[PDB]
Amino acid sequence: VGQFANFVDLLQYRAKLQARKTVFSFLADGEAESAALTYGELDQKAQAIAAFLQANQAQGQRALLLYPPGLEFIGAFLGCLYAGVVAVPAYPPRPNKSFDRLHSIIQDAQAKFALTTTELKDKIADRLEALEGTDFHCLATDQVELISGKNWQKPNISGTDLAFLQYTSGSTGDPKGVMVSHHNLIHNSGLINQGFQDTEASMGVSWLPPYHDMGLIGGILQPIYVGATQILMPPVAFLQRPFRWLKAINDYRVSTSGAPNFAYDLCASQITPEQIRELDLSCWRLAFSGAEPIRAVTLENFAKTFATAGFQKSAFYPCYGMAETTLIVSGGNGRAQLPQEIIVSKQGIEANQVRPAQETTVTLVGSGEVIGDQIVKIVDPQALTECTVGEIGEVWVKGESVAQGYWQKPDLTQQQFQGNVGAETGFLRTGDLGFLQGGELYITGRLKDLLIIRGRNHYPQDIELTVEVAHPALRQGAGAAVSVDVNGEEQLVIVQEVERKYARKLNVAAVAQAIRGAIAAEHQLQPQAICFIKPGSIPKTSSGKIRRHACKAGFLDGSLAVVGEWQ
Ligand SMILES: Nc1ncnc2c1ncn2[C@@H]1O[C@H](COP(=O)(O)O)[C@@H](O)[C@H]1O
Ligand SMILES: [Mg+2]
**Rounded distance between C-alpha atoms, residue 345 and residue 350, angstroms:** 9
Q: Do the bridges between strand 474-486 and strand 489-498 make them parallel or antiparallel, or are there none, so unpaired?
A: antiparallel
Rounded to 5 degrees, what are φ and ψ at 501? -70, -20
> What is the secondary structure of 292-342 as a DSSP string?
S---HHHHHHHHHHTTTTT--GGGEEEEEE-GGGSSEEEES-TTSSSPPEE
Mutate to test the pocket of ligand 1, among 298, 432, 462 (most ligand atoms within 8 A of CB): 432
- Quoted resolution (Å): 2.0
Q: At what angle do helices 118-132 and 100-109 cross, to 10 degrees?
A: 70
Amino acid at 522: E
Determine contact, residues 467/429, Cβ cutoff 8 Å.
Answer: no
State which H helix or E strand residue 39 sits in.
helix 39-55
Decide whether any atom of ligand 1 lies within 6 Å of the 168 Cβ. yes
- Burial readout 124-145 (b: 16 or more C-beta within 10 A, e: otherwise): bbeebeeebeeebbbbbbbebe
d(CA 188, CA 193): 8
- DSSP class of residue 549 equals H
The count of other CB atoms within 10 Å of the CB of residue 279 is 20
| Whole-angstrom distance, CA of residue 1 vs CA of residue 186 | 10
Antiparallel, parallel or unpaired: β 286-289 and 316-321: parallel
SS (H, E, C) 425-491: EEEEEEEEEEEEECCEEEEEEECCCCEEECCEEECHHHHHHHHHCCCCCEEEEEEEEEEEEECCEEE
517 bridge partner residues: none
Q: Using alpha carbons only, what angle is made at residue 407 by residues 401 and 410, rounded to the nearest 5 degrees?
A: 100
432 is in an annotated binding site: yes
What separation in angstroms does the CA of 396 have from each of 201, 313, 351, 410? 36, 30, 20, 19
Calpha distance 451→66 (Å, rounded): 37
Ligand 1 pocket member 265 (CB < 6 A)? no
Residue of 285, 38, 54, 79 lying closest to 164 (CA atoms): 79
- CA 261 – CA 365 distance, rounded (Å): 12
449: left (phi over 0), alpha (psi -120 to 50) or beta: alpha
Task: List, in sequence order, every residue forming a beta bridge with 419; answer none if it has no partner.
Answer: 427
No. of helices (H) and no. of strands (E), the chain: 18, 28
Q: What is the identity of the amino acid at 4?
A: F
**Angle ∠(47,227,77) on CA atoms, nearest 5:** 35
Candidates 217, 214, 287, 301; CA nearest to 245 is 287
Q: What is the rounded distance in angstroms from the CA atom of residue 90 to the CA atom of residue 102?
A: 8
Q: Which helix (H) or strand (E) holds 361?
A: strand 361-365
The full DSSP string for 69-127 is SSHHHHHHHHHHHHHT-EEEE-PPP-TT---HHHHHHHHHHT--EEEE-HHHHHHHHHH
Q: How was this entry determined? A: X-ray
Question: For the domain bounded by 448-566, which CATH number is listed?
Answer: 3.30.300.30
- Report helix, strand or coil for 523: helix
Q: Whose CA is nearest to atom 19 of ligand 1?
A: 322
Residue 319 assigned to a binding site: yes
CA–centroid distance, residue 431 to ligand 1 (Å): 10
- Give the integer Cα–Cα distance in Å for 102 and 464: 30
Closest protein CA for atom 16 of ligand 1: 322
Cα(213)–Cα(325) distance, integer angstroms = 10
Q: What's the CA dihedral at 94, 163, 202, 45 to 10 degrees?
A: 70
**Spatial CB neighbours of 306, under 8 Å, sequence gap ≥ 6:** 246, 267, 268, 276, 279, 281
DSSP state of 418: S
How far is Cα of residue 424 from the mean position of the Cα atoms in its chain? Answer: 29
For residue 44, CA distances in Å to 62, 211, 372, 417 come to 22, 22, 34, 37
Residue 156 burial (CB count, 10 A)? 6
Is 9 part of any known ligand binding site? no
213 is in an annotated binding site: no
Pairwise CA distance, residues 360 & 521, whole Å: 11
Contact between 528 and 522 under an 8 Å Cβ cutoff? The reply is: no
Residue 277, burial from CB neighbour count under 10 angstroms (0-12, 13-18, 19+): exposed
Whether the CB of 403 sits within 6 Å of ligand 1: no
